[PDB]
Ligand binder design. Structure first.
Ligand SMILES: O=C(O)Cc1cc(I)c(Oc2ccc(O)c(I)c2)c(I)c1
Ligand SMILES: O=C(O)Cc1cc(I)c(Oc2ccc(O)c(I)c2)c(I)c1
Ligand SMILES: C=CC(=O)c1ccc(CCCCCC)cc1
Ligand SMILES: C=CC(=O)c1ccc(CCCCCC)cc1
Lengths: 250, 245
């Protein structure tokens, strides 16, 4: 199995550092985290015939720490030379299209089977039900499943970073100008990623193929996020929408 | 570097591994032949046992039980123990090894456990099925074992350790058994350094799973008493009754 080249190790060091420099609570999150009160995000005893509405209370708790998560995704991308080479127009499109994907990933990787929750921003542990009633709905199930399936993969910072790099450089986003260039960047990240994986030596058959499918799951989650956001603008009042949160979809 | 298994330990590792493989339902992918228990079965509209769901479990309970016994008998160290000791050890690890085997077959995508490698069931089906909370304990164990990526050898060794529990009430060759367990832990410990898993504090956390399997085995004993009160005698296979006397 071909391992990463000197140049790729250089690239790997750039992404890993960029990710670690933007990944909250890089200093033990499962020790300083705080569990969201049980009473918050509790399944409705009545359940409206509509189809389940968004728990405005839980939603408030989620959006109160959403901005930092969004800005962090932007800082990560700006720490990558390749990204900084892209036009302003392209950068915005790529960020708005991978924002939720990368965040969902960051949360998924922080899945704790013992408490069966996700540590958002590495400080808030939420249950599958709390995140759902919080406004993500079925999306919560998608993210939780992802986290459960990623356990056996034991992804390190370099693999999560590279994963984020691949999600960031999506040349299939609508409106992109440097379609070709961006794809060259992605292929570079993918190549370095795969090579790094051979170096890591994971104990799981068809690791590479299975991981790529996860990129596909993130794409689905990101899309469902946009649709889920539409219901939020309908049920959730404006006062609960942070500055960057709304622009990420508008 | 960490110490790896010696030549003598490799042969022991070979024995236990082949013993487990010969008594386990895989070596051919259990996801290609497994079937899902009808959703309508084991539905939950303490708690009463779902007779129908129960019947489906005990219908394949004997095979699982007989395999654990076969596993132990394929181990020379076990055959050197008195009949009374063998009976004691088996009755004390049966559910332990069984739970372990079911846990390792956990499937995140379907969120179920493939019993005997042919019947997949949900947390609810197994709970109302008669295991109650024990079902949650087994599913929890299965979820925490994903990152461990245990191979047949590690599960086999794990079963060996559970088997050679010299603290079982009534045992006679307590020291001979203890000696056997350590030989497995040592070989297991060395094998672990060979594999080299990417899970921080792998060894410590795995050993802890052994303690969880201990609790699961105990909670099942008390759970079995509820079954002999709610479930009719017909649904109790002969070998199933004796094992958990
Ligand atoms: O875990 C991290 O670092 C990043 C992170 C932060 C948050 I707050 C988060 O939850 C969301 C996201 C969108 C949304 O509309 C709602 I309501 C909740 C997730 I998923 C991930
Ligand atoms: O999966 C395997 O190979 C072995 C296996 C087989 C069975 I059937 C099983 O379920 C049980 C066990 C005890 C009990 O009282 C009831 I009701 C159901 C489990 I957990 C594991
Ligand atoms: C959708 C993405 C954007 O347009 C976007 C969002 C946020 C930012 C960062 C602004 C500074 C925020 C304080 C750190 C830049 C661009
Ligand atoms: C509790 C364990 C036992 O005592 C035990 C259980 C089963 C067997 C196998 C008997 C063979 C009959 C066909 C399965 C032997 C011993």
């Amino acid at each position: 199995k071909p391992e990463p080249t000197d140049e790729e190790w250089e690239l790997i060091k750039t992404v890993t550092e960029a990710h670690v420099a933007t990944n909250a609570q890089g200093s033990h999150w499962k020790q300083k985290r705080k569990f969201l009160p049980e009473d918050i995000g509790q399944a409705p005893i009545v359940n409206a015939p509509e189809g389940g509405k968004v728990d405005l209370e839980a939603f408030s708790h989620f959006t109160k720490i959403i901005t930092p998560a969004i800005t962090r995704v932007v800082d990560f991308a700006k720490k990558l030379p390749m990204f900084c080479e892209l036009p302003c127009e392209d950068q915005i499109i790529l960020l708005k299209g991978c924002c939720m994907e990368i965040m969902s990933l960051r949360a998924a990787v922080r899945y704790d089977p013992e408490s069966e929750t996700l540590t958002l921003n590495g400080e808030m542990a939420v249950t599958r039900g709390q995140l759902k009633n919080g406004g993500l709905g079925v999306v919560s199930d998608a993210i939780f499943r992802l986290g459960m399936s990623l356990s056996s993969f034991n992804l390190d910072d370099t693999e999560v970073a590279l994963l984020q790099a691949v999600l960031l450089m999506s040349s299939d986003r609508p409106g992109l100008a440097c379609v070709e260039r961006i794809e060259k960047y992605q292929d570079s990240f993918l190549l370095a990623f795969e090579h790094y994986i051979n170096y890591r030596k994971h104990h799981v058959t068809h690791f590479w193929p299975k991981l790529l499918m996860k990129v596909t799951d993130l794409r689905m989650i990101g899309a469902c996020h946009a649709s889920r956001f539409l219901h939020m603008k309908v049920e959730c009042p404006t006062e609960l929408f942070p500055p960057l949160f709304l622009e990420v979809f508008e």
